[PDB]
Design an enzyme around this catalytic site. Structure first.
Site, mmCIF file in Angstrom:
data_model
loop_
_atom_site.group_PDB
_atom_site.id
_atom_site.type_symbol
_atom_site.label_atom_id
_atom_site.label_comp_id
_atom_site.label_asym_id
_atom_site.label_seq_id
_atom_site.Cartn_x
_atom_site.Cartn_y
_atom_site.Cartn_z
ATOM 1 C CB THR A 1 -1.085 0.080 1.257
ATOM 2 O OG1 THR A 1 -1.533 -1.353 1.619
ATOM 3 C CG2 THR A 1 -2.257 0.700 0.719
ATOM 4 C CD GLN A 2 4.673 5.206 -1.079
ATOM 5 O OE1 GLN A 2 5.256 4.374 -0.218
ATOM 6 N NE2 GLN A 2 5.095 6.290 -1.707
#
Ligand SMILES: Cc1ccccc1CCC(=O)N[C@H](C(=O)N[C@@H](CCc1ccccc1)C(=O)NCc1ccccc1Cl)[C@@H](C)O
Ligand SMILES: [Mg+2]
Ligand SMILES: [Mg+2]
Lengths: 242, 233, 212, 233, 250, 237, 235, 241
Positions: free
Chosen positions: D1-2
């Protein structure tokens, strides 16, 4: 009595030296390397006649191509054998081959170093050095038959022949005279039996002394009591004729 | 003054001395002699191997650290194994992360810093081994001397171990000559074997006795033992 | 994959196919689905090739270690339970294996253990394992008798794998045959389905949904 | 995630006969908002290397600081830090590629596409790419994002293979770069008119050009365009 | 960085003594006298404020401390050890009791917790025992009023009246002569004052003496009205003037 | 270490100072826009490679460190100072101020005088550089004590070095250039070497000057060094 | 925690030495109950007798201990023993058999004897308990972690003298009332004080629920000790 | 938390703490074990000093590790419980993983390893205990007897003894035990075991305890009455000449 890893003014590690003394108090073990195999023999030394002598395990298999004899504080040798067996089997698992004898010895000597507390660099899980020495005999394709002397100092030497334990001063001088590069396995078997016979307190028979060898073809074998007995006969008759 | 002040590496003597370190230094003098020297193109290690018995192997004094770097040992051999493995790792890390061969100088600093931590930590001992480090990097040939006090110095030539004072004086005398043995591996080795001779109450140096190593401009670090050293005796 | 092992009067027959697949792509036709752990111990493989290869190779190591430690061959019960217990530690992580541990000891006699990645471990006389299992079962069950000769029992094993190799898209290549006795594992050859099918059809008169 | 927030668009580059050229515009976009206008996305490291970064600008700023710390760290205990032991393009690259791959492996990438351009100490041109996945490759021409689709085909008309490199002058190469930047300004909705350009020559050294502008644009033909099919006026 | 005394510093001697506990008790003996007397409807704890300098402001240093609204403490021995013990005692009243049962601990159990904290300093690696003895006085619904002594070893004892520190033997003697089971609180305060005068060298007034009681609820000290079942702290420190008032008819 | 003597002293630290006194002499001089650092390198043997056993160390880009005593202890201190300077710059973006950096080292050296399981450092360190508000020079003892200096010296030649430094402070109260301070450093090291005239030595100089190095730490090499050596050789005779 | 050249544990021996100065505690097992009696360490008139328990502690509804040694050490161990009894109750839904509780406590003491460099607990226990496997039981544990079962036993001061007196007068077919007498007589004979009065004693029984089929722990109030002290003829 | 080295080497090569642990064994009550042709008998002495004990509840010296293997000891009583517990755990664990009870050699090797480990670990002292481990391997009729000591050394014995005055009873057993003619059955095996104790106990009422182990998990304790009849017949027979 201040530290377990202190140097003396001469530059020696106190505790390492004293462990070497403990080995001198142990049973005699002799190894002889030939081009037809390596023979390992030990004095059993039962502390009483009620001790069942064949329960005395001073020669042990590490892998089909590696065996070893021990002398000194023999209980200390269990975890060393366990490590050796694991290292050999693990190597075969990782690499689909036999571990080199020299590599197996170096592994056992690394384990021997792991005494103290932690040593600002890595980590140590042992309070004192091992009080036992090992003779490690085997075969591999690169260097053939090999004999190593593994010391609790973490050093190891290759030997053509080697004696350890209480009779080692007398046996080594004996081995200096008797050893030659042309020895057969049968000549080696007889020499080990001869030199043990010399240094032992008790009279050598098939119950107070034990024989083994490692050959490329049949691997590591501990000779049973019938086989050594027959080799004792042969030694009795050989010397009595000279 | 020496009495109650040598129990650990964490105590200063009233002179400001660290006796445990000085005692570790004393194990090097007990060690078998080894010589290092270099020209502008090559660096050579020469070492007198020692046997326990006449039935025994002669123990190795030279360890390879990378293709461009290796060392010789005098003192506690298992300590040399610990320090060379660390050096092999530092060499490795440099290649993998930076695609860069480790400078011989940086190898010196890393060994120094490692030794130092053991001259100041309770419960541990100092290292009891001296090392001579040769290598060829982006600035040519190099020789280093490592003392387990953590002092590392760069030199044209040196020797450590028992009776090494002879070999050292020899090299000090021959400086101007050997520094210029460029493009000639065999002459540089010859001058190294020459140097280790000034350190013999022992005897004649045999084929089992002798261990030589070389690194240089177009030579990876290589160890010679046994039959492969005969042409220098 | 199709693998089987069954116990009869004269020991154990072990038979396996040699097809590897990835989806509908045939990866190999010559793969080894039997691991010879020791002269008295065999393991069969079905499911994830890596999972099987890796852990049954590991099992061999653990079995050898037992020999050194205890100075005696490992029991079939115990070899299977090592693998069973390891695989149970990994439960839910997605290991995919269908396995038979087959062999002989003095104390146990000929023994077969089925072990899978769910952690199930069963002792029994007859197992078929893999995508082809049902096909193998069909032929094996309807011709199985305890008192089969060695020659006949070997043939039934052979014939059962061929059946599965014929009907199951994911089986095929060749049959590898094994017989396990008192002194026990003996290899009975590789048998390419290419030749074997036509030979068996000819000599037996079976396979009548096939033209030519 | 990002997920990337503030971003930079193409970085384009090629090898000519004596070195490398690299360029990137000065925009920091915030989705479709052309938010920041003085963003420098060319990072000189020493005087032999320029690092061009596209993607997330916060990650770019993080990578800048890593590069600066790397110059600091290399100078430490290094008397040859401005000579033989100065950071090479290949050292800087291998370092970044290591970081990028480690970060993707920890499921926490640096959301960037990076081109390392420069000249090795032996005079060799260095041009290599690394991105958020740790994917790396080298080519006579390299471009990121839209540049990959639109600059490469134009640049490849000049340097189509290795042998085209000795045949290519600074003038020709720069002309091709400057033109490809104009094309990108025509068709990339996240591009800017202002850009920086850097040349790293084996004889000239590093020339860093700031505040360049797309010139000689064709827009006159727009007046003849009416409607979207049938409309005549 | 790291401890090299991971072993007990209090160990048994060949004769069975726990040296460090004995030596701690010696430190308590040199300490300024403190005492406690239990009445039928209250407890009084008292002590002398021996000041280090006359430039010091003795009101900024209390020897008598509130632990819970119904429990107070006083000590003899090393003041700083007391100060930190009070912190831990206040805290443990909450963490081990009030955050669990939504009410304050009864006197014996809090004393029990303090005792544990002192016992641990007697067995743990790398520490010396606390150099204090505490007197802890409290009230609770189901046990009424009580008075406890706690020693460096972690021992506690319930007392009708006792004294600790310097002149403790003479004061315990004076208390055995004067105590009975019909004493009202004012009588116990009176005896506390008398007993303290023999132990006090210098001036004897409300500025040099420190005194507190566990009596009935002080609704005026609660800080809020409207909840009838909340009646206020029973711990009360007497003012300088309140002390001087009782020293006139002494 | 953690042990106070009956009169408040720390014998172990006092003994650590003895290791320092036994060391090679090193100095620092604070000029009107920077700082200069010089150190005596004993040539044990002709075999030592000239210029190649660098003693003076850089921290960040703007700080020089020199020390006398146990050399490895000094390196240990500089490693820590580098971690400490990086940590500061990471959070605050600006390069660490010299006083800020001084305390970092100070607190670290002091910590090694608190615990029985550790020994104090066997070095004194002279360090400094240029920051937002000028030049700063510091000296730090084994106890962790440190102050700002106009000039500083440590090691075996310390007393004569301090005497020379004290003269310069008197003859030049109005500042004193970086170029002069370099020359004068070479001089003072030469005069301090007088004690050890039995063995030969090598001179190392570094400087950090606002106008001469642009506030960066830089080793004095080439002609500038030779000019400073010639000045020292001249003024010794 | 180290061995002497004699093969003895110094710190354990010295802890045992310390215990032989603590007030004597006596336990006697009869066929229909158990008696626990203990002498308080020489006190004052001003000690609150009504709220004092330095020697007798309840472990659960069926098990109690008499303490000799450091009280603070004992409270530590008692607390863990109480927890251990409840863990067992929670796990098995049965009250802990007495030996199981005793073994565990003895194991905790043994530990301090073998690793960790901490001093041993300066405590000896007499355990008095009932369960449906062995009925009434009496055990003893000391700082070494060794534990033993007894029909009658003493700990603390004068154990040698108290042991001889118990050996003399004890008989298997005793009732609890006979055991109550024996315990008080033995303490009277071994005291180092003038007279064995109520204020210097702690006393407890484990009988048969007054009249029920259940087991009841009676921890004697001061007044009851005074009464039982006259009855047995020591006033 | 605490791992300082207490077991170290002496100048002459011994580990003092291990040697002093042997001393602790020396002073512990005597224990003996002899094996018959189809059984193993274990005997232990109980001290005279205190005899107001409850024998129903006092821990006895012979402990079942599993239903086919027993353990007795000499030395620190509290130390023995740690070894017995670990051995019991290992026994169940072995049944769990190998699907077979331990052999006597396996159990011994394990106990001995535990003992050894406590001689090379920081912050722990060796076990002041020596053990006799006896029983029958699963599906085996050949009786087994092993001895361990604080060092971690172990070996098998036809008969052996440990504890105080073990030197005397060993001497007795060395004279009276014939290897080619081992005690034919339980009765004569028990008798020899009781005789060897009678050299050291000196009234030997309920002071001697006995446990007989037979093949296939047949292990029984002997009562006072059952032992009495052995002691009676021994001194009655051995009187005439
Ligand atoms: C698990 C994974 C992670 C990441 C990327 C890929 C994969 C799966 C890789 C694959 O499918 N490999 C094939 C495989 O295992 N095929 C299986 C059949 C498909 C499958 C079933 C169940 C789980 C995974 C995959 C097979 O042939 N199996 C027969 C077999 C063949 C050789 C040795 C042993 C065995 Cl059991 C080999 C042959 O390339
Ligand atoms: Mg098919
Ligand atoms: Mg100074």
């Amino acid at each position: 009595d201040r530290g377990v890893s202190t140097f003396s003014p001469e530059g020696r590690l106190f505790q390492v030296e004293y462990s070497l003394e403990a080995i001198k108090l142990g049973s005699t073990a002799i190894g002889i390397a030939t081009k037809e195999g390596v023979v390992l023999g030990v004095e059993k030394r039962a502390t009483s006649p009620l001790l069942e002598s064949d329960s005395i395990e001073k020669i042990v298999e590490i892998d089909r191509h590696i065996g070893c004899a021990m002398s000194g504080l023999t209980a200390d040798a269990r975890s060393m054998i366990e490590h050796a067996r694991t290292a050999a089997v693990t190597h075969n698992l990782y690499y689909d081959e036999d571990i080199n004898v020299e590599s197996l010895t170096q592994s056992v000597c690394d384990l021997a170093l792991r005494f103290g507390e932690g040593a600002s660099g890595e980590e140590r899980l042992m309070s004192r050095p091992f009080g036992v020495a090992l003779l490690i005999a085997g075969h591999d394709a690169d260097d053939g038959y090999q004999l190593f002397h593994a010391e609790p100092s973490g050093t190891f030497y290759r030997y053509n022949a080697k004696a350890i334990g209480s009779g080692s001063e007398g046996a080594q001088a004996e081995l200096l005279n008797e050893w030659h590069s042309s020895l057969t396995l049968k000549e080696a078997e007889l020499l080990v039996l001869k030199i043990l016979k010399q240094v032992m307190e008790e009279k050598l028979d098939e119950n107070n002394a034990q024989l083994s060898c490692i050959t490329k073809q049949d691997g590591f074998k501990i000779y049973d009591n019938e086989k050594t007995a027959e080799l004792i006969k042969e030694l009795k008759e050989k010397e009595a004729a000279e | 003054f020496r009495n109650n002040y040598d129990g650990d590496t964490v105590t200063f003597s009233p002179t400001g001395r660290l006796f445990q370190v000085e005692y570790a230094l004393e194990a090097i003098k007990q060690g078998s002699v080894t010589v290092g020297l270099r020209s502008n193109t090559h660096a050579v290690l020469v070492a007198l191997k020692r046997n326990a018995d006449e039935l025994s192997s002669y123990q190795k004094k030279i360890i390879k650290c990378d293709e461009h770097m290796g060392l010789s040992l005098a003192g506690l051999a298992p300590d040399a194994r610990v320090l060379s493995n660390y050096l092999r790792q530092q060499c490795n890390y440099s290649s993998l992360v930076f695609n860069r061969k480790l400078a011989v100088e940086r190898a010196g600093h890393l060994l120094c810093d490692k030794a130092q931590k053991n001259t100041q930590s309770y419960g541990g001992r100092p290292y009891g081994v001296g090392l001579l480090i040769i290598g060829y990097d982006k600035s040519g040939a190099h020789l280093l001397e490592f003392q387990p006090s953590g002092n590392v110095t760069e030199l044209y030539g040196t020797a450590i171990g028992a009776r090494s004072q002879g070999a050292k004086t020899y090299l000090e005398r021959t400086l101007d000559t050997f520094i210029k043995i460029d493009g000639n591996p065999d002459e540089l080795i010859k001058a190294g074997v020459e140097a280790i001779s000034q350190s013999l109450r022992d005897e004649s140096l045999t084929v089992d006795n002798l261990s030589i190593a070389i690194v240089g401009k177009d030579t990876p670090f290589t160890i010679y033992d046994g039959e492969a050293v005969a042409k220098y005796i | 994959t199709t693998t089987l092992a069954f116990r009869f009067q004269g020991g154990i027959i072990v038979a396996v196919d040699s097809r590897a697949t990835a989806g509908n792509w045939v990866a190999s036709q010559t793969v080894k689905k039997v691991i010879e752990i020791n002269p008295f111990l065999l393991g069969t493989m079905a499911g994830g090739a890596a999972d099987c290869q890796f852990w049954e190779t590991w099992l061999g190591s653990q079995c050898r270690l037992h020999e050194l430690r205890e100075k005696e061959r490992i029991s079939v019960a115990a070899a299977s339970k090592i693998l069973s217990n390891l695989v149970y530690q990994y439960k839910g992580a997605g290991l995919s294996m269908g396995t038979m541990i087959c062999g002989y000891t003095r104390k146990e006699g000929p023994t077969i253990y089925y072990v899978d990645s769910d952690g199930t471990r069963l002792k029994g006389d007859i197992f078929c394992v893999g995508s082809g299992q049902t096909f193998a079962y069909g032929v094996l069950d309807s011709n199985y008798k305890w008192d089969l000769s060695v020659e006949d029992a070997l043939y039934l094993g052979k014939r059962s794998i061929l059946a599965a190799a014929h009907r199951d898209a994911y089986s095929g290549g060749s049959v590898n045959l094994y017989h396990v006795t008192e002194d026990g594992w003996i290899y009975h050859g590789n048998h390419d389905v290419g030749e074997l099918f036509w030979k068996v059809k000819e000599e037996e008169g079976s396979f009548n949904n096939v033209i030519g | 995630t990002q997920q990337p927030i503030v971003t930079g668009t193409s970085v384009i580059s090629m090898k000519y006969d004596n070195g490398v050229i690299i360029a990137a515009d000065n925009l920091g976009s915030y989705g479709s908002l052309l938010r920041f206008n003085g963003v420098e996305r060319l990072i000189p490291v020493g005087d032999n290397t320029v690092v061009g970064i596209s993607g997330d600008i916060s990650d770019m700023q993080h990578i800048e600081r890593l590069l600066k710390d790397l110059v600091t760290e290399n100078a430490y205990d290094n008397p040859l830090a401005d000579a033989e032991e100065a950071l090479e393009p290949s050292y800087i690259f291998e370092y970044l590629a290591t970081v990028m791959y480690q970060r993707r492996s920890k499921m926490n990438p640096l959301w960037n596409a990076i081109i390392v351009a420069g000249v090795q100490s032996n005079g060799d041109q260095f041009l290599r790419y690394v991105n958020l996945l740790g994917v790396t490759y080298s080519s006579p021409t390299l471009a990121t994002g839209f540049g990959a689709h639109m600059a490469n085909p134009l640049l490849r008309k000049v340097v189509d293979r290795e042998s085209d490199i000795p045949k290519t002058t600074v003038q020709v190469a720069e002309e091709a770069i400057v033109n490809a930047m104009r094309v990108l300004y025509y068709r990339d909705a996240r591009s800017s008119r202002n850009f920086s350009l850097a040349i790293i020559d084996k004889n000239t050294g590093l020339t860093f050009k700031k505040n360049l502008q797309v010139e000689n644009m064709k827009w006159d033909f727009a007046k003849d365009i009416k409607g979207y099919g049938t409309q005549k006026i | 960085m790291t401890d090299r005394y991971s072993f007990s510093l209090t160990t048994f001697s060949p004769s069975g003594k726990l040296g460090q506990i004995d030596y701690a008790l010696t430190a308590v003996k040199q300490g300024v006298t403190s005492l406690g007397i239990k009445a039928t409807n209250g407890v009084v704890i008292a002590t002398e404020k021996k000041s280090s300098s006359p430039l010091a402001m003795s009101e900024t240093l209390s020897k008598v401390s509130l632990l819970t609204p119904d429990i107070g403490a006083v000590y003899s021995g090393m003041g700083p050890d007391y100060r930190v013990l009070v912190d831990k005692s206040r805290k443990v009243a909450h963490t081990s009791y009030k955050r669990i049962y939504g009410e304050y601990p009864p006197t014996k159990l809090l004393v029990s917790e303090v005792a544990k904290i002192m016992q641990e300093a007697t067995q743990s690696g790398g520490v010396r025992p606390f150099g204090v003895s505490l007197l802890i006085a409290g009230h609770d619904e189901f046990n009424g009023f009580s008075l406890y002594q706690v020693d460096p070893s972690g021992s506690y004892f319930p007392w009708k009246a006792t004294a600790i520190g310097k002149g403790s033997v003479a004061a315990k003697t004076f208390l055995e002569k004067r105590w009975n089971d019909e004493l009202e609180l004012e009588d116990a305060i009176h005896i506390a004052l008398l007993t303290l005068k023999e132990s006090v060298e210098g001036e004897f007034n409300g500025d040099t003496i420190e005194l507190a009681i566990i009596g009935d609820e002080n609704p005026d000290l609660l800080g809020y009205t409207g909840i009838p079942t909340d009646k206020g702290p029973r711990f009360r420190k007497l003012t300088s003037q309140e002390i001087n008032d009782r020293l006139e008819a002494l | 270490n953690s042990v106070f003597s009956p009169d408040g002293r720390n014998f172990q630290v006092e003994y650590a100072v003895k290791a320092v006194e036994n060391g090679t002499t090193s100095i620092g001089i604070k000029c009107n826009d920077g700082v200069v650092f010089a150190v005596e390198k004993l040539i044990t043997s002709k075999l030592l490679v000239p210029q190649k056993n660098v003693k003076i160390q850089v921290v960040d880009r703007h700080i020089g460190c020199v020390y006398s005593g146990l050399i490895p202890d000094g390196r240990h201190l500089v490693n820590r100072g580098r971690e400490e300077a990086a940590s500061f710059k990471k959070l605050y973006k600006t390069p660490i101020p010299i006083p800020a950096f001084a305390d970092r080292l100070g607190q670290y050296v002091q910590a090694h005088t608190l615990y029985n399981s550790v020994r104090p450092f066997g070095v004194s360190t002279i360090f400094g550089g240029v920051d937002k508000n000028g030049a700063h020079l510091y000296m730090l003892e084994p106890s962790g004590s440190y102050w700002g200096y106009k000039g500083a010296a440590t090691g075996k030649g310390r007393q004569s070095a301090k005497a020379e430094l004290e003269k310069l402070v008197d003859h030049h109260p109005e500042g004193l250039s970086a170029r002069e301070a370099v020359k004068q450093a070479a001089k003072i090291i030469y005069l301090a070497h007088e004690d050890n005239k039995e063995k030969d030595f090598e001179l190392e100089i570094s400087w950090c000057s606002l106008s001469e190095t642009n506030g960066l730490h830089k080793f004095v090499k080439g002609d500038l060094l030779q000019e400073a050596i010639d000045f020292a050789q001249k003024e010794i005779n | 925690t180290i061995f002497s050249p004699e093969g003895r544990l110094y710190q354990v021996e010295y802890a045992l030495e310390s215990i032989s100065h603590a007030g004597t505690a006596i336990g006697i097992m009869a066929s229909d109950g158990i008696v626990l009696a203990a002498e308080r360490k020489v006190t004052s008139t001003l000690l609150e007798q009504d709220t004092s328990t330095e020697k007798l502690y309840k472990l659960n509804d069926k098990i109690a201990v008499a303490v000799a040694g450091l009280t603070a050490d004992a409270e530590i161990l008692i607390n863990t023993a109480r927890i251990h009894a409840q863990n067992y109750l929670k796990t098995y839904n049965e009250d802990i058999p007495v030996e199981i509780l005793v073994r565990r406590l003895s194991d905790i003491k043994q530990g301090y004897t073998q690793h960790g460099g901490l001093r041993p607990f300066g405590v000896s226990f007499i355990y008095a308990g009932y369960d449906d496997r062995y009925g009434y039981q009496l055990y003893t544990s000391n700082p070494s972690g060794n534990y033993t079962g007894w029909k009658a036993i003493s700990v603390g001061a004068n154990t040698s003298a108290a042991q001889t007196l118990l050996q003399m007068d004890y008989k298997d077919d005793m009732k609890v009332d006979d055991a109550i007498e024996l315990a008080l007589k033995t303490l009277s004979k071994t005291t180092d004080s003038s007279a064995l009065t109520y204020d210097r004693l702690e006393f407890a029984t484990i009988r048969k629920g007054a009249n029920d089929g259940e087991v009841y722990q009676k921890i004697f109030k001061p007044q009851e000790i005074k009464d039982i002290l006259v009855k047995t003829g020591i006033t | 938390g605490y791992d300082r080295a207490l077991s170290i080497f002496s100048p002459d090569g011994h580990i003092f703490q291990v040697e002093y642990a042997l001393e602790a064994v020396k002073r512990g009550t005597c224990a003996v074990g002899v094996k018959g042709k189809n059984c193993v008998v274990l005997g232990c002495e109980r001290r005279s000093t205190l005899k107001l004990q409850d024998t129903r509840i006092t821990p006895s010296k012979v402990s079942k590790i599993d239903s086919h293997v027993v353990l007795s000891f000499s030395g620190l009583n509290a130390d023995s419980r740690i070894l017995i517990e670990k051995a019991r755990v290992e026994a169940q664990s072995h049944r769990l993983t190998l699907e077979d009870p331990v052999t006597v050699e396996y159990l011994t090797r394990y106990v001995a390893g535990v003992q050894q480990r406590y001689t090379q670990s920081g912050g722990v002292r060796p076990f002041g205990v020596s053990t006799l481990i006896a029983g029958f391997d699963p599906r085996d009729d050949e009786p087994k007897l092993y001895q361990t000591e604080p060092s971690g050394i172990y070996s098998s014995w036809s008969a052996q003894t440990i504890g105080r005055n073990s030197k005397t009873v060993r001497e007795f057993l060395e004279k009276n035990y014939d290897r080619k003619e081992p005690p034919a059955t339980v009765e004569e095996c028990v008798k020899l075991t009781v005789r060897s104790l009678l050299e050291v106990v000196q009234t030997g009422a309920k002071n001697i305890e006995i446990t007989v182990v037979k093949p296939d998990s047949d292990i029984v304790a002997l009562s006072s009455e059952e032992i009495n009849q052995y002691v009676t017949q021994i001194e009655q027979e051995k009187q005439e000449q």
